[PDB]
Amino acid sequence: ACGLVASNLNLKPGECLRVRGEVAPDAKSFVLNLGKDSNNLCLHFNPRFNAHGDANTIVCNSKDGGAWGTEQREAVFPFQPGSVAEVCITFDQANLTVKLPDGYEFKFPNRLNLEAINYMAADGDFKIKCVAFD
Amino acid sequence: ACGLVASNLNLKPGECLRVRGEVAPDAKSFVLNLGKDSNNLCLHFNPRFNAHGDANTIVCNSKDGGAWGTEQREAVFPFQPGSVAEVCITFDQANLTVKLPDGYEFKFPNRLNLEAINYMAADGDFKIKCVAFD
């Protein structure tokens, strides 16, 4: 329930995006959506410190016009609650590259052929204080 | 016709906002709107290099729910077309403080008693690549 929303970000492939923010002291739930339309998101992040009864578990999936989405499961968490961290996100038509402030890199195939990113929304226990383009 | 739009910026008085961007090579028209609702903007900027037949002329006014607005006229332009520049904007309930990358400072009374900024939109010949909070 805490994250700024952006629009008109028209991001093309081959560009790097860096976001620096501060994770609340109670990092329990986060929601991210970066695509073009609300139901047409290319990437979705939803880490959960402890919801039903799990720990440091991350869910990642994509949606097309509210159709479906290949939701996977990532079990890596190089961050702690109440800690400032930056995440590098690169969206390319060939594939998606994402790196953490302290970890390796993970790529996800972009079944969609979107060449521009126009929708970017984030709301959760994470606080974004600045957005940088390339 | 070129400027990203932001939302959920809930900015309180006593905070400084810095925006770094790049002005297109044809800096002819710019539009800015920072308030809470589309018709409830507290500050509006609209510099015009040459429209009807004027030069480096800036118009500044405020609106409340689409009611009225004390539009004034500022004739200062410490910038050139095709040039990167940063502008510091501070919104306080006592008054509004605005400084340019190379110039003095100008304050405008905020007849409205808005304690938080939730709407921020900019579209024109200026390009914003990063937004920084305090």
Side-chain angles (χ1 to χ4, degrees), chain B residues 37-128:
Chain B
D37 291 352
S38 172
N39 294 339
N40 307 253
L41 299 177
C42 81
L43 287 170
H44 175 79
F45 291 90
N46 210 136
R48 297 176 67 183
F49 180 73
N50 193 37
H52 182 225
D54 296 342
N56 298 110
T57 294
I58 302 169
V59 168
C60 297
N61 81 297
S62 296
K63 222 203 300 192
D64 181 6
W68 317 86
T70 311
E71 183 178 13
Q72 297 183 153
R73 193 181 69 92
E74 303 296 351
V76 169
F77 46 97
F79 59 87
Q80 277 88 51
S83 170
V84 302
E86 295 178 359
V87 168
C88 311
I89 298 173
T90 295
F91 177 90
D92 298 332
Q93 289 181 295
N95 78 63
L96 303 178
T97 281
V98 171
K99 291 193 290 186
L100 292 116
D102 189 334
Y104 304 94
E105 171 178 343
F106 178 73
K107 288 182 176 181
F108 169 84
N110 60 276
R111 183 181 179 181
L112 293 175
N113 310 151
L114 177 58
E115 65 180 352
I117 304 299
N118 310 262
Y119 193 83
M120 187 177 87
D123 184 345
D125 295 339
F126 167 76
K127 182 178 181 179
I128 184 171

Coordinates of all heavy atoms in Angstrom, one line a residue, chain B residues 37-128:
Chain B
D37 N -5.4 17.3 -8.1 CA -6.3 16.9 -9.2 C -6.0 17.6 -10.5 O -5.4 18.6 -10.5 CB -7.7 17.1 -8.6 CG -8.0 16.2 -7.5 OD1 -7.2 15.3 -7.2 OD2 -9.1 16.4 -6.8
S38 N -6.5 17.1 -11.6 CA -6.3 17.8 -12.9 C -6.7 19.3 -12.8 O -6.1 20.2 -13.3 CB -7.1 17.0 -13.9 OG -7.1 17.7 -15.1
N39 N -7.9 19.6 -12.3 CA -8.4 21.0 -12.2 C -7.9 21.7 -10.9 O -8.2 22.8 -10.7 CB -9.9 20.9 -12.2 CG -10.4 20.3 -13.6 OD1 -9.7 20.3 -14.5 ND2 -11.5 19.7 -13.6
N40 N -7.2 21.0 -10.1 CA -6.8 21.6 -8.8 C -5.3 21.7 -8.8 O -4.6 21.1 -7.9 CB -7.4 20.7 -7.7 CG -8.9 20.5 -8.0 OD1 -9.7 21.1 -7.3 ND2 -9.3 19.8 -9.0
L41 N -4.7 22.4 -9.7 CA -3.2 22.5 -9.7 C -2.8 23.7 -8.9 O -3.4 24.8 -8.9 CB -2.9 22.7 -11.2 CG -3.3 21.5 -12.0 CD1 -3.0 21.8 -13.5 CD2 -2.6 20.3 -11.5
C42 N -1.7 23.6 -8.1 CA -1.3 24.7 -7.3 C -0.2 25.5 -8.1 O -0.1 26.7 -7.9 CB -0.6 24.1 -6.1 SG 1.1 23.6 -6.5
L43 N 0.5 24.9 -9.0 CA 1.5 25.7 -9.8 C 1.4 25.2 -11.3 O 1.3 24.1 -11.6 CB 2.8 25.4 -9.2 CG 3.0 26.1 -7.8 CD1 4.2 25.6 -7.1 CD2 3.1 27.6 -8.1
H44 N 1.5 26.2 -12.2 CA 1.4 25.8 -13.6 C 2.5 26.6 -14.4 O 2.6 27.8 -14.3 CB 0.0 26.2 -14.1 CG -0.1 26.0 -15.6 ND1 -0.3 24.8 -16.2 CD2 0.0 26.9 -16.6 CE1 -0.3 25.0 -17.5 NE2 -0.2 26.2 -17.8
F45 N 3.4 26.0 -15.1 CA 4.4 26.7 -15.9 C 4.2 26.6 -17.4 O 3.7 25.5 -17.9 CB 5.7 26.0 -15.5 CG 6.1 26.3 -14.1 CD1 5.6 25.4 -13.1 CD2 6.8 27.4 -13.8 CE1 5.9 25.7 -11.7 CE2 7.1 27.7 -12.4 CZ 6.7 26.8 -11.4
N46 N 4.4 27.6 -18.2 CA 4.1 27.5 -19.6 C 5.0 28.5 -20.4 O 4.5 29.5 -20.9 CB 2.6 27.9 -19.8 CG 2.1 27.1 -21.0 OD1 1.0 26.6 -21.0 ND2 2.8 27.1 -22.1
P47 N 6.3 28.3 -20.4 CA 7.2 29.1 -21.1 C 7.0 29.0 -22.7 O 6.7 28.0 -23.2 CB 8.6 28.6 -20.7 CG 8.3 27.2 -20.4 CD 7.0 27.1 -19.8
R48 N 7.2 30.1 -23.4 CA 7.0 30.0 -24.9 C 8.1 30.8 -25.6 O 8.2 32.0 -25.6 CB 5.7 30.7 -25.1 CG 4.6 29.9 -24.4 CD 3.2 30.6 -24.5 NE 2.9 30.5 -26.0 CZ 1.8 31.1 -26.5 NH1 1.4 32.3 -26.0 NH2 1.1 30.5 -27.4
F49 N 9.0 30.0 -26.3 CA 10.1 30.7 -27.0 C 9.5 31.6 -28.1 O 9.9 32.8 -28.3 CB 10.8 29.5 -27.7 CG 12.0 30.1 -28.5 CD1 13.1 30.6 -27.8 CD2 12.0 30.1 -29.9 CE1 14.2 31.1 -28.6 CE2 13.0 30.6 -30.6 CZ 14.2 31.1 -30.0
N50 N 8.5 31.2 -28.9 CA 7.9 32.0 -29.9 C 6.6 31.5 -30.4 O 6.6 30.6 -31.2 CB 8.9 32.1 -31.1 CG 8.6 33.2 -32.0 OD1 8.1 34.2 -31.6 ND2 8.7 33.0 -33.3
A51 N 5.5 32.0 -29.9 CA 4.2 31.4 -30.3 C 3.4 32.5 -31.2 O 3.6 32.5 -32.4 CB 3.4 31.2 -29.0
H52 N 2.7 33.3 -30.5 CA 2.0 34.4 -31.3 C 3.0 35.3 -32.0 O 2.8 35.7 -33.1 CB 1.1 35.1 -30.3 CG 0.3 36.2 -31.0 ND1 0.2 37.5 -30.5 CD2 -0.5 36.2 -32.1 CE1 -0.6 38.2 -31.3 NE2 -1.0 37.5 -32.3
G53 N 4.0 35.6 -31.3 CA 5.1 36.5 -31.8 C 5.9 37.2 -30.7 O 6.2 38.3 -30.8
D54 N 6.1 36.4 -29.7 CA 6.9 37.0 -28.5 C 8.2 36.2 -28.4 O 8.6 35.4 -29.2 CB 6.0 36.8 -27.3 CG 4.8 37.6 -27.4 OD1 4.8 38.5 -28.3 OD2 3.8 37.3 -26.7
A55 N 8.9 36.4 -27.3 CA 10.2 35.7 -27.1 C 10.4 35.4 -25.6 O 9.8 36.1 -24.8 CB 11.3 36.6 -27.6
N56 N 11.2 34.5 -25.3 CA 11.5 34.1 -23.9 C 10.5 34.7 -22.9 O 10.8 35.4 -22.0 CB 12.9 34.6 -23.6 CG 13.9 34.0 -24.5 OD1 14.4 34.6 -25.4 ND2 14.2 32.7 -24.4
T57 N 9.2 34.3 -23.0 CA 8.2 34.9 -22.1 C 7.6 33.7 -21.3 O 7.3 32.6 -21.9 CB 7.1 35.5 -23.0 OG1 7.7 36.6 -23.7 CG2 5.9 35.9 -22.2
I58 N 7.5 33.8 -20.0 CA 7.0 32.7 -19.2 C 5.6 33.0 -18.5 O 5.5 34.1 -18.0 CB 8.0 32.4 -18.2 CG1 9.4 32.1 -18.9 CG2 7.6 31.2 -17.3 CD1 10.5 32.2 -17.9
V59 N 4.7 32.1 -18.5 CA 3.4 32.4 -17.9 C 3.2 31.5 -16.7 O 3.4 30.3 -16.7 CB 2.3 32.1 -18.9 CG1 0.9 32.0 -18.3 CG2 2.3 33.1 -20.0
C60 N 2.9 32.1 -15.5 CA 2.7 31.2 -14.3 C 1.4 31.5 -13.6 O 1.1 32.6 -13.2 CB 3.9 31.6 -13.4 SG 5.5 31.2 -14.2
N61 N 0.6 30.5 -13.4 CA -0.7 30.7 -12.7 C -1.1 29.4 -11.9 O -0.5 28.4 -12.0 CB -1.7 31.0 -13.8 CG -2.2 29.6 -14.4 OD1 -1.4 28.9 -15.0 ND2 -3.4 29.3 -14.3
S62 N -2.2 29.5 -11.1 CA -2.6 28.4 -10.3 C -4.2 28.2 -10.5 O -4.9 29.1 -10.9 CB -2.4 28.7 -8.9 OG -0.9 28.9 -8.7
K63 N -4.7 27.0 -10.3 CA -6.1 26.8 -10.5 C -6.8 26.0 -9.4 O -6.1 25.1 -8.8 CB -6.3 26.0 -11.9 CG -7.5 26.6 -12.7 CD -7.9 25.5 -13.6 CE -6.8 25.1 -14.6 NZ -7.5 24.3 -15.6
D64 N -8.0 26.2 -9.1 CA -8.7 25.4 -8.0 C -9.9 24.7 -8.6 O -11.0 25.4 -8.8 CB -9.0 26.4 -7.0 CG -9.7 25.7 -5.8 OD1 -9.7 24.5 -5.8 OD2 -10.2 26.4 -4.9
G65 N -9.9 23.4 -8.8 CA -11.1 22.7 -9.3 C -11.5 23.4 -10.6 O -12.7 23.3 -11.0
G66 N -10.6 24.0 -11.4 CA -11.0 24.6 -12.7 C -11.8 25.9 -12.4 O -12.6 26.3 -13.2
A67 N -11.6 26.5 -11.3 CA -12.3 27.8 -11.0 C -11.6 29.0 -11.7 O -11.9 29.4 -12.8 CB -12.2 27.9 -9.5
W68 N -10.5 29.5 -11.1 CA -9.8 30.7 -11.7 C -8.3 30.5 -11.6 O -7.8 29.4 -11.7 CB -10.3 31.9 -10.9 CG -11.8 31.8 -10.7 CD1 -12.3 31.2 -9.6 CD2 -12.8 32.4 -11.4 NE1 -13.7 31.3 -9.7 CE2 -14.1 32.1 -10.8 CE3 -12.9 33.2 -12.6 CZ2 -15.3 32.5 -11.3 CZ3 -14.1 33.6 -13.1 CH2 -15.3 33.3 -12.5
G69 N -7.6 31.6 -11.4 CA -6.1 31.4 -11.3 C -5.4 32.8 -11.5 O -5.6 33.5 -12.4
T70 N -4.5 33.1 -10.6 CA -3.8 34.4 -10.7 C -2.6 34.3 -11.6 O -1.5 34.1 -11.2 CB -3.3 34.7 -9.3 OG1 -4.4 34.6 -8.3 CG2 -2.8 36.1 -9.2
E71 N -2.9 34.3 -12.9 CA -1.7 34.2 -13.9 C -0.8 35.4 -13.9 O -1.3 36.5 -14.1 CB -2.4 34.0 -15.2 CG -1.4 33.8 -16.3 CD -2.1 33.6 -17.7 OE1 -3.3 33.9 -17.7 OE2 -1.5 33.1 -18.6
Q72 N 0.4 35.2 -13.7 CA 1.4 36.4 -13.7 C 2.3 36.3 -14.9 O 1.9 35.7 -15.9 CB 2.2 36.2 -12.4 CG 1.3 36.3 -11.2 CD 2.1 36.2 -9.9 OE1 1.8 36.7 -8.9 NE2 3.3 35.6 -9.9
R73 N 3.4 37.0 -14.9 CA 4.2 37.0 -16.1 C 5.7 37.1 -15.7 O 6.1 38.1 -15.2 CB 3.8 38.2 -17.0 CG 4.4 38.1 -18.4 CD 4.0 39.3 -19.2 NE 4.7 40.5 -18.6 CZ 5.9 40.8 -19.0 NH1 6.7 40.0 -19.7 NH2 6.4 42.0 -18.8
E74 N 6.5 36.1 -16.0 CA 7.9 36.2 -15.6 C 8.8 36.3 -16.9 O 8.7 35.5 -17.8 CB 8.2 34.8 -14.9 CG 7.2 34.7 -13.7 CD 7.5 35.9 -12.7 OE1 8.5 36.5 -12.9 OE2 6.8 36.0 -11.8
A75 N 9.7 37.3 -16.9 CA 10.5 37.4 -18.2 C 12.0 37.0 -17.9 O 12.9 37.7 -18.3 CB 10.4 38.9 -18.5
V76 N 12.2 35.9 -17.3 CA 13.6 35.4 -17.1 C 13.8 34.1 -17.7 O 13.0 33.2 -17.6 CB 13.7 35.3 -15.5 CG1 15.0 34.6 -15.2 CG2 13.8 36.8 -15.0
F77 N 14.9 33.9 -18.4 CA 15.1 32.6 -19.1 C 16.6 32.2 -19.1 O 17.3 32.4 -20.0 CB 14.6 32.8 -20.5 CG 15.2 34.1 -21.0 CD1 16.3 34.1 -21.8 CD2 14.5 35.3 -20.8 CE1 16.8 35.3 -22.3 CE2 15.0 36.5 -21.2 CZ 16.2 36.5 -22.0
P78 N 17.1 31.7 -18.0 CA 18.5 31.3 -17.8 C 18.7 29.9 -18.5 O 19.4 29.1 -18.0 CB 18.7 31.1 -16.3 CG 17.3 30.8 -15.8 CD 16.3 31.4 -16.7
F79 N 18.2 29.7 -19.7 CA 18.4 28.4 -20.4 C 18.4 28.5 -21.9 O 17.9 29.5 -22.4 CB 17.3 27.5 -19.9 CG 16.0 28.1 -20.2 CD1 15.4 27.8 -21.5 CD2 15.3 28.9 -19.3 CE1 14.1 28.4 -21.8 CE2 14.1 29.5 -19.6 CZ 13.5 29.2 -20.9
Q80 N 18.8 27.6 -22.6 CA 18.8 27.6 -24.1 C 18.3 26.3 -24.6 O 18.2 25.3 -23.9 CB 20.3 27.8 -24.5 CG 20.6 29.3 -24.4 CD 21.1 29.6 -23.0 OE1 22.0 29.0 -22.5 NE2 20.6 30.6 -22.3
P81 N 17.9 26.3 -25.9 CA 17.3 25.1 -26.5 C 18.4 24.0 -26.7 O 19.5 24.3 -26.8 CB 16.8 25.6 -27.8 CG 17.6 26.8 -28.1 CD 18.0 27.4 -26.8
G82 N 18.0 22.7 -26.6 CA 19.0 21.7 -26.8 C 20.0 21.7 -25.6 O 21.2 21.6 -25.8
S83 N 19.6 22.0 -24.4 CA 20.5 22.1 -23.3 C 20.0 21.3 -22.0 O 18.8 21.5 -21.7 CB 20.6 23.6 -23.0 OG 21.3 23.8 -21.8
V84 N 20.8 20.6 -21.4 CA 20.4 19.9 -20.1 C 20.3 20.9 -19.0 O 21.2 21.7 -18.8 CB 21.4 18.8 -19.9 CG1 21.5 17.9 -21.1 CG2 22.8 19.5 -19.6
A85 N 19.3 20.8 -18.2 CA 19.2 21.8 -17.0 C 18.4 21.2 -15.9 O 17.5 20.3 -16.1 CB 18.4 23.0 -17.6
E86 N 18.6 21.6 -14.7 CA 17.9 21.0 -13.5 C 17.1 22.2 -12.8 O 17.6 23.3 -12.6 CB 18.9 20.5 -12.6 CG 19.6 19.3 -13.3 CD 20.7 18.7 -12.4 OE1 20.9 19.3 -11.3 OE2 21.4 17.8 -12.8
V87 N 15.9 21.9 -12.4 CA 15.2 23.0 -11.6 C 14.8 22.5 -10.2 O 14.2 21.5 -10.1 CB 13.9 23.3 -12.5 CG1 12.9 24.2 -11.7 CG2 14.3 24.0 -13.8
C88 N 15.0 23.3 -9.2 CA 14.7 22.9 -7.9 C 13.3 23.5 -7.5 O 13.0 24.7 -7.6 CB 15.7 23.6 -7.0 SG 17.4 23.2 -7.6
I89 N 12.4 22.7 -7.1 CA 11.0 23.2 -6.8 C 10.7 22.8 -5.3 O 10.7 21.6 -4.9 CB 10.1 22.5 -7.7 CG1 10.4 22.9 -9.2 CG2 8.6 22.9 -7.4 CD1 9.5 22.0 -10.1
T90 N 10.3 23.8 -4.5 CA 10.0 23.5 -3.1 C 8.6 24.0 -2.8 O 8.3 25.2 -3.1 CB 11.0 24.3 -2.3 OG1 12.3 23.7 -2.5 CG2 10.6 24.2 -0.8
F91 N 7.7 23.2 -2.4 CA 6.3 23.6 -2.1 C 6.0 23.7 -0.6 O 6.0 22.6 0.0 CB 5.4 22.6 -2.8 CG 4.0 22.9 -2.6 CD1 3.3 23.7 -3.4 CD2 3.3 22.3 -1.4 CE1 1.9 24.0 -3.2 CE2 2.0 22.6 -1.2 CZ 1.3 23.5 -2.1
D92 N 5.8 24.8 -0.1 CA 5.5 25.0 1.4 C 4.2 25.7 1.5 O 3.8 26.5 0.7 CB 6.7 25.8 1.9 CG 8.0 25.1 1.7 OD1 8.0 23.9 1.7 OD2 9.0 25.8 1.6
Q93 N 3.5 25.3 2.6 CA 2.1 26.0 2.8 C 2.4 27.5 3.0 O 1.5 28.3 2.6 CB 1.5 25.4 4.0 CG 1.1 23.9 3.7 CD 0.4 23.3 4.9 OE1 1.1 23.1 5.9 NE2 -0.8 23.0 4.9
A94 N 3.4 27.9 3.6 CA 3.7 29.4 3.8 C 3.8 30.1 2.5 O 3.2 31.1 2.2 CB 5.0 29.5 4.6
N95 N 4.6 29.5 1.6 CA 4.7 30.1 0.2 C 5.4 29.1 -0.7 O 5.8 28.0 -0.3 CB 5.6 31.3 0.4 CG 7.1 30.9 0.6 OD1 7.7 30.4 -0.3 ND2 7.7 31.2 1.8
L96 N 5.6 29.4 -2.0 CA 6.3 28.5 -2.9 C 7.7 29.0 -3.3 O 7.8 30.1 -3.7 CB 5.4 28.5 -4.1 CG 3.9 28.1 -3.7 CD1 3.0 28.1 -4.9 CD2 4.0 26.6 -3.1
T97 N 8.7 28.2 -3.1 CA 10.1 28.6 -3.5 C 10.5 27.9 -4.8 O 10.5 26.7 -4.8 CB 10.9 28.2 -2.3 OG1 10.8 29.1 -1.3 CG2 12.4 28.2 -2.7
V98 N 11.0 28.6 -5.8 CA 11.5 28.0 -7.0 C 12.8 28.6 -7.4 O 13.0 29.8 -7.6 CB 10.4 28.3 -8.0 CG1 10.8 27.8 -9.4 CG2 9.1 27.5 -7.6
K99 N 13.8 27.7 -7.7 CA 15.1 28.3 -8.1 C 15.5 27.6 -9.5 O 15.2 26.5 -9.8 CB 16.1 27.9 -7.0 CG 15.8 28.7 -5.8 CD 17.0 28.5 -4.8 CE 17.1 27.1 -4.3 NZ 18.2 27.1 -3.2
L100 N 16.2 28.4 -10.3 CA 16.7 27.9 -11.6 C 18.2 27.5 -11.5 O 18.8 27.8 -10.5 CB 16.5 29.1 -12.5 CG 15.0 29.4 -12.7 CD1 14.7 30.8 -12.1 CD2 14.7 29.3 -14.2
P101 N 18.6 26.8 -12.5 CA 20.1 26.3 -12.5 C 21.0 27.5 -12.6 O 22.1 27.5 -12.2 CB 20.2 25.4 -13.7 CG 19.0 25.9 -14.6 CD 17.9 26.3 -13.7
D102 N 20.5 28.6 -13.1 CA 21.4 29.8 -13.2 C 20.5 31.1 -13.1 O 20.2 31.7 -14.1 CB 22.1 29.7 -14.5 CG 23.2 30.8 -14.7 OD1 23.0 31.8 -14.0 OD2 24.1 30.5 -15.4
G103 N 20.1 31.5 -12.0 CA 19.3 32.7 -11.8 C 19.0 33.0 -10.4 O 19.5 32.3 -9.5
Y104 N 18.1 33.9 -10.1 CA 17.8 34.2 -8.7 C 16.6 33.3 -8.2 O 16.4 32.2 -8.7 CB 17.3 35.7 -8.7 CG 18.4 36.5 -9.3 CD1 18.4 36.8 -10.6 CD2 19.5 37.0 -8.5 CE1 19.5 37.6 -11.2 CE2 20.5 37.7 -9.0 CZ 20.5 38.0 -10.4 OH 21.5 38.8 -10.9
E105 N 15.8 33.8 -7.3 CA 14.7 32.9 -6.8 C 13.4 33.7 -6.8 O 13.3 34.9 -6.6 CB 15.1 32.6 -5.3 CG 13.9 32.0 -4.6 CD 14.3 31.6 -3.2 OE1 15.5 31.6 -2.9 OE2 13.4 31.4 -2.4
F106 N 12.3 33.1 -7.1 CA 11.0 33.8 -7.1 C 9.9 33.0 -6.3 O 9.8 31.8 -6.3 CB 10.6 33.8 -8.6 CG 9.2 34.4 -8.7 CD1 9.1 35.8 -8.6 CD2 8.1 33.7 -9.0 CE1 7.9 36.5 -8.7 CE2 6.8 34.3 -9.1 CZ 6.7 35.7 -9.0
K107 N 9.2 33.8 -5.5 CA 8.2 33.1 -4.6 C 6.8 33.5 -5.0 O 6.5 34.6 -5.4 CB 8.5 33.5 -3.2 CG 9.8 32.9 -2.7 CD 10.0 33.3 -1.2 CE 11.3 32.6 -0.7 NZ 11.4 33.1 0.7
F108 N 5.8 32.6 -4.9 CA 4.4 32.9 -5.3 C 3.5 32.5 -4.1 O 3.7 31.4 -3.6 CB 4.2 32.1 -6.5 CG 2.7 32.1 -6.8 CD1 2.1 33.2 -7.5 CD2 1.9 31.1 -6.4 CE1 0.7 33.2 -7.8 CE2 0.5 31.1 -6.7 CZ -0.1 32.1 -7.4
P109 N 2.6 33.3 -3.7 CA 1.7 32.9 -2.6 C 0.8 31.8 -3.0 O 0.3 31.7 -4.1 CB 1.0 34.2 -2.3 CG 1.0 34.9 -3.6 CD 2.3 34.6 -4.3
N110 N 0.6 30.9 -2.1 CA -0.3 29.7 -2.4 C -1.6 29.9 -1.8 O -2.0 29.4 -0.7 CB 0.4 28.5 -1.8 CG 0.6 28.6 -0.3 OD1 1.6 29.3 0.2 ND2 -0.3 28.1 0.5
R111 N -2.5 30.7 -2.4 CA -3.8 31.0 -1.8 C -4.5 29.7 -1.3 O -5.2 29.7 -0.4 CB -4.6 31.5 -3.0 CG -6.0 31.9 -2.6 CD -6.8 32.4 -3.8 NE -8.2 32.8 -3.3 CZ -9.1 33.2 -4.1 NH1 -8.7 33.9 -5.1 NH2 -10.3 33.0 -3.9
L112 N -4.2 28.6 -1.9 CA -4.7 27.3 -1.5 C -4.0 26.8 -0.3 O -2.8 27.0 -0.1 CB -4.6 26.3 -2.7 CG -5.5 26.8 -3.8 CD1 -5.2 25.9 -5.1 CD2 -6.9 26.7 -3.4
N113 N -4.7 26.0 0.6 CA -4.0 25.5 1.8 C -3.7 24.0 1.6 O -3.9 23.2 2.5 CB -5.0 25.7 2.9 CG -5.4 27.2 2.9 OD1 -6.5 27.5 3.3 ND2 -4.6 28.1 2.4
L114 N -3.3 23.6 0.4 CA -3.0 22.2 0.2 C -1.7 21.8 1.0 O -0.7 22.4 0.8 CB -2.8 22.0 -1.3 CG -2.5 20.6 -1.6 CD1 -3.6 19.6 -1.1 CD2 -2.3 20.4 -3.1
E115 N -1.8 20.8 1.8 CA -0.6 20.3 2.6 C 0.1 19.1 1.9 O 1.1 18.7 2.3 CB -1.2 19.9 3.9 CG -2.1 18.7 3.8 CD -2.6 18.2 5.2 OE1 -2.2 18.8 6.1 OE2 -3.5 17.4 5.2
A116 N -0.5 18.6 0.8 CA 0.2 17.5 0.1 C 0.1 17.6 -1.4 O -1.0 18.0 -1.9 CB -0.6 16.2 0.6
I117 N 1.1 17.2 -2.1 CA 1.0 17.3 -3.6 C 0.8 15.9 -4.2 O 1.6 15.0 -3.9 CB 2.4 17.8 -4.1 CG1 2.7 19.2 -3.4 CG2 2.4 18.0 -5.6 CD1 1.6 20.2 -3.8
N118 N -0.2 15.6 -4.9 CA -0.5 14.2 -5.4 C -0.5 14.2 -6.9 O -0.3 13.1 -7.5 CB -1.9 13.9 -4.8 CG -1.9 14.2 -3.3 OD1 -1.7 13.3 -2.5 ND2 -2.1 15.4 -2.9
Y119 N -0.6 15.3 -7.6 CA -0.7 15.3 -9.1 C 0.6 16.0 -9.6 O 0.8 17.1 -9.3 CB -1.9 16.0 -9.4 CG -2.2 15.8 -10.9 CD1 -2.9 14.6 -11.3 CD2 -1.8 16.7 -11.9 CE1 -3.2 14.4 -12.7 CE2 -2.1 16.5 -13.2 CZ -2.8 15.3 -13.6 OH -3.0 15.1 -14.9
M120 N 1.3 15.4 -10.5 CA 2.4 16.0 -11.2 C 2.5 15.7 -12.6 O 2.7 14.5 -13.0 CB 3.7 15.5 -10.4 CG 4.9 16.3 -10.9 SD 6.3 15.7 -9.9 CE 6.8 14.3 -11.0
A121 N 2.3 16.6 -13.5 CA 2.3 16.2 -15.0 C 3.1 17.3 -15.8 O 3.0 18.4 -15.6 CB 0.8 16.2 -15.4
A122 N 3.9 16.8 -16.7 CA 4.6 17.7 -17.6 C 4.7 17.2 -19.0 O 4.9 16.0 -19.2 CB 6.1 17.7 -17.0
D123 N 4.4 18.0 -19.9 CA 4.4 17.6 -21.4 C 4.7 18.8 -22.3 O 4.1 19.8 -22.2 CB 2.9 17.1 -21.6 CG 2.8 16.6 -23.0 OD1 3.7 16.8 -23.8 OD2 1.8 15.9 -23.3
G124 N 5.8 18.7 -23.0 CA 6.2 19.8 -23.9 C 7.5 19.5 -24.6 O 7.8 18.4 -24.9
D125 N 8.2 20.5 -24.9 CA 9.5 20.3 -25.6 C 10.6 20.0 -24.6 O 11.8 19.9 -25.0 CB 9.8 21.6 -26.3 CG 8.7 21.9 -27.4 OD1 8.1 20.9 -27.8 OD2 8.6 23.0 -27.8
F126 N 10.3 19.7 -23.4 CA 11.3 19.4 -22.3 C 11.3 17.9 -22.0 O 10.3 17.3 -22.0 CB 10.9 20.2 -21.1 CG 11.7 19.7 -19.9 CD1 13.1 20.0 -19.8 CD2 11.1 18.8 -19.0 CE1 13.8 19.5 -18.7 CE2 11.8 18.4 -17.9 CZ 13.2 18.7 -17.7
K127 N 12.4 17.3 -21.9 CA 12.4 15.8 -21.6 C 13.0 15.5 -20.2 O 14.1 15.9 -19.9 CB 13.4 15.2 -22.7 CG 13.4 13.7 -22.5 CD 14.3 13.1 -23.6 CE 14.3 11.6 -23.5 NZ 15.2 11.2 -24.6
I128 N 12.2 14.9 -19.3 CA 12.7 14.6 -18.0 C 13.2 13.1 -17.9 O 12.5 12.2 -18.2 CB 11.4 14.7 -17.1 CG1 11.8 14.5 -15.6 CG2 10.4 13.7 -17.5 CD1 10.7 14.9 -14.7

